[PDB]
Amino acid sequence: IVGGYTCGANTVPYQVSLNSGYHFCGGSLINSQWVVSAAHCYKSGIQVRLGEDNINVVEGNEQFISASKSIVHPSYNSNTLNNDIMLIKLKSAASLNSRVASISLPTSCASAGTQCLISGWGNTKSSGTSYPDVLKCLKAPILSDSSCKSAYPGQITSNMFCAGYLEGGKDSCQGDSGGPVVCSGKLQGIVSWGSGCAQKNKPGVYTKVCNYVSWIKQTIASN
Template sequence: MKDGKGTYRCGADGAWEDILTLSRDLPVCVPDCALKRDTASSRIIGGRNAQLGQFPWQAHITTEDSRGAGVLLHDKWIITTARLLQEVDLSQVVIKLGTTSLREENYIQGEPGEVFIHKDYGNGTIDNDNDIGLIKLKNKIPIGENVQGICLPTKEAHFHISHRESDHHVGIVAGFGQTEMSRISSRLLFVEVDVVEQQTCREAYQKRYDRVVSENMICAGHAEGGRDTCTGDAGTALAFLDAKTNKWFIGGIASWGSNCGDKHYPGVYTRVSNYLDWIENIIKNN
């Protein structure tokens, strides 16, 4: 139940009613999200095989001319990058959930009904700024042990993400993208990445590629390199564990980068906390 309040009974006419108020307006039922499961420690690029149910929010998305990832929210919405959804033909979009192998036929398929791209994506002077989009599915996804939405953060301080040890500074990413062998993986892989100090990341990309890392972005990788998302991973979650609830929340969405696994140029992720109002408004009004 969304607000966690109320006690209900079956009324004389067979309808549910609130014991205190006699109201028949039932509360909204929101599926639970991303409870922590044992995750083997690993320090994609540099990844190891995921087990079924370890990343129950993971979605693999293919379009007419591209492939990437998405992240299940609740049971009818998927969050991903705007880039993957631009000018997409929904009849050509295939969404697979509840699997760790693209060679298996045992998966749950999500049927896209409508897509929403942030209105400021591609309209500014900064490449890949506001790289966020939502897919509304035609039907609800059956939630279970192996398929479950990830939690969204709130604006509370304890969800803050930075390179500082006092904040969420180590995240985990999973995907079917390109590996260090330069091949697309048929198995779901995962790896831990460290959040990189914003100014360090900004200066590296500005100096070498003349690209801007905005405040709408998070950089994550590893000081020695070799841990990263890569081609085919765009749209996957940079997930963090909330110690208060023992649940995973999505802090970032894999967006762009350079030279997968290069220690000087970490992966760049859309900072989800900057778009909470946008996400809420889209879902509420659609």
């Protein structure tokens, strides 16, 4: 997250870190056994880390649980990033408490101008790299369809939206992928892609979770 702020420990209790001997992506806890992340984050050897603040220090309140299933959307396209969503089933259920909690799925889509909270342990620089110890947060609005298509002509599908700031300086970045975009208590987006980070006229692009609620529910029910 570039241009954000230190969340505070466990203030985003649905945020998870996906770890393969290092933090590689984010995710969102949607019930005690399932996490939503990005398809482009898929790999073998995923350990889900819940209750994290400093990802480099054991502070208390962490739960580390192996992924038992990692289910990429069958129509995920790695060239366009259409359908950039994955479900992870935990090997054992997480223990839910004030610091480890699920986030609700949307019942309807969010409109342009809706304010959201985007979070992660990704890069904090727009040029070069710096990776934080603690979780970072950014408040950002959903942009209009027209503004999103103007920024990324030919690249925005119906399963994507843009959020952030056209003036530069405030965005998600590498290492934030898979993490949450929460608006009014609902998981409306997944950190997906963008051109650079925090560059003028190049906002973040997010998977539009409301389009997938039935697919999530059906996939969880059958697994």
